A paper describes a structure:
PHD homologues exist in other types of eukaryotes and prokaryotes where they act on non HIF substrates. The respective prolyl-hydroxylases (DdPhyA and TgPhyA) catalyze prolyl-hydroxylation of S-phase kinase-associated protein 1 (Skp1), a reaction enabling adaptation to different dioxygen availability. In the cellular slime mold Dictyostelium discoideum, the human parasite Toxoplasma gondii and the crop pathogen Pythium ultimum, PHD-type 2OG oxygenases catalyze the hydroxylation of a prolyl residue in the S-phase kinase-associated protein (Skp1). This enables Skp1 glycosylation in a manner proposed to regulate protein degradation via effects on the SCF class of E3-ubiquitin ligase of which Skp1 is an essential subunit; however, glycosylation independent roles of Skp1 prolyl hydroxylation are also manifested.
Following construct optimization and use of thermal shift assays, which revealed that Ni(II) ions and N-oxalylglycine (a stable 2OG analog) stabilize the enzymes, we obtained crystals of DdPhyA(60-284) (space group C2221, 3 molecules per asymmetric unit, resolution 2.02 Å) from which we were able to determine a structure by molecular replacement. Consistent with all reported 2OG oxygenase structures, DdPhyA contains an eight stranded “distorted” DSBH (βI-βVIII) core-fold. The structure has three disordered regions (Asn134–Leu142 (finger loop), Asn230–Glu244 (β5(IV)/β6(V) loop), and Arg161–Arg174 ((II)–β4(III) loop)). Each of these disordered loops is likely involved in substrate binding, as is the case for some other 2OG oxygenases (see below). The DdPhyA active site contains three protein metal ion ligands, i.e. His191, Asp193, and His266, which form the conserved HXD…H motif present in most, but not all, 2OG oxygenases. Octahedral coordination of the nickel ion (substituting for iron) is completed by a water molecule and the oxalyl group of NOG, the latter in a bidentate manner. The C-5 carboxylate of NOG is bound via a salt bridge involving both its oxygens with the Arg276 guanidino group and via one of its oxygens with the Tyr212 alcohol. Although there are minor differences, e.g. in the precise 2OG methylene/NOG NH positions, the geometry of the metal ion and NOG/2OG-binding elements of DdPhyA are strikingly similar to those observed in HsPHD2 and TaPHD. Notably, the C terminus of DdPhyA is much shorter than all other prolyl hydroxylases for which structures are available, i.e. it is truncated at the end of β9 (VIII, C-terminal residue: Tyr284). The results for DdPhyA, however, demonstrate that an extended prolyl hydroxylase C terminus is not necessary for efficient coupling of 2OG turnover with substrate oxidation.
Author numbering: 58 to 109, 113 to 132, 143 to 232, 245 to 284
Write the structure that this text describes.
């Protein structure tokens, strides 16, 4: 079923701060197309190094190649399909939590190569571009086919929601967690490419 939030799951998200949904699409043919289209974006020089050699601005902080996808004759049709599915989750957030009132979404396609990592951080921030907080909910969809237990690249999610747990970035896995509260980091990658599609709900 495509409804994510029932009595228990909502309580887990509010208490534990995260929620893991495996076999989100459960469509192998589509998963492979999302992988291919995501990989082609990198091959076609459509990504950018997030950490860019200026001081404290290099691959020490984060070493992935990212692209910001603007969302509502296309090369990323199947990626857009996933993003639409993720948009339905946002709709469910608004319908189940009365005062959530989503403002907008922000999407990032990220590719890590061998040896890539992302130091501890939280996704939420406050900048002059908006009066209020940015990024309340984080939704990460992994597309790494045939990931084994030694390839690294796991997401280390620190369970401290006002100890950690290593989440394997296996294909078709959807990770949801509260952006302002859960600290996390990407452990070093021993395989390539590590593909992850994130949609933040503001
Ligand atoms: O890709 C992941 O698993 C984790 N990504 C992030 O934390 C990020 O882009 O801010
Ligand atoms: Ni279901
Ligand atoms: Ni993050």
């Amino acid at each position: 079923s495509m409804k994510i939030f029932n009595k228990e799951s909502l309580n887990q998200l509010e208490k534990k701060g995260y929620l893991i949904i495996d076999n989100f699409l459960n469509d192998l043919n589509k998963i492979n197309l999302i992988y291919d289209e995501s990989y082609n974006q990198f091959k076609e020089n459509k990504l950018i190094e997030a950490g860019m050699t200026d001081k404290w601005k290099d691959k020490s902080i984060r070493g992935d190649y990212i692209q910001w996808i603007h969302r509502d004759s296309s090369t990323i049709r199947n990626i857009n399909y996933l993003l639409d599915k993720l948009d339905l989750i946002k709709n469910e957030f608004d319908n189940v939590i009365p005062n959530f009132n989503s403002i907008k979404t922000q999407t990032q396609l990220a590719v890590y190569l061998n040896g890539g990592r992302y130091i501890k951080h939280r996704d939420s921030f406050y900048s002059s571009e908006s009066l209020t907080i940015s990024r309340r909910i984080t939704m990460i969809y992994y597309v790494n086919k045939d990931w084994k237990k030694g390839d690294g690249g796991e997401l280390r999610l620190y369970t401290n929601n006002p100890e950690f747990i290593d989440i394997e970035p296996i294909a078709d896995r959807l990770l949801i967690f509260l952006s302002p509260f859960l600290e996390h980091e990407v452990l070093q990658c021993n395989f390539e490419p590590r593909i992850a599609i994130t949609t933040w709900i503001y």
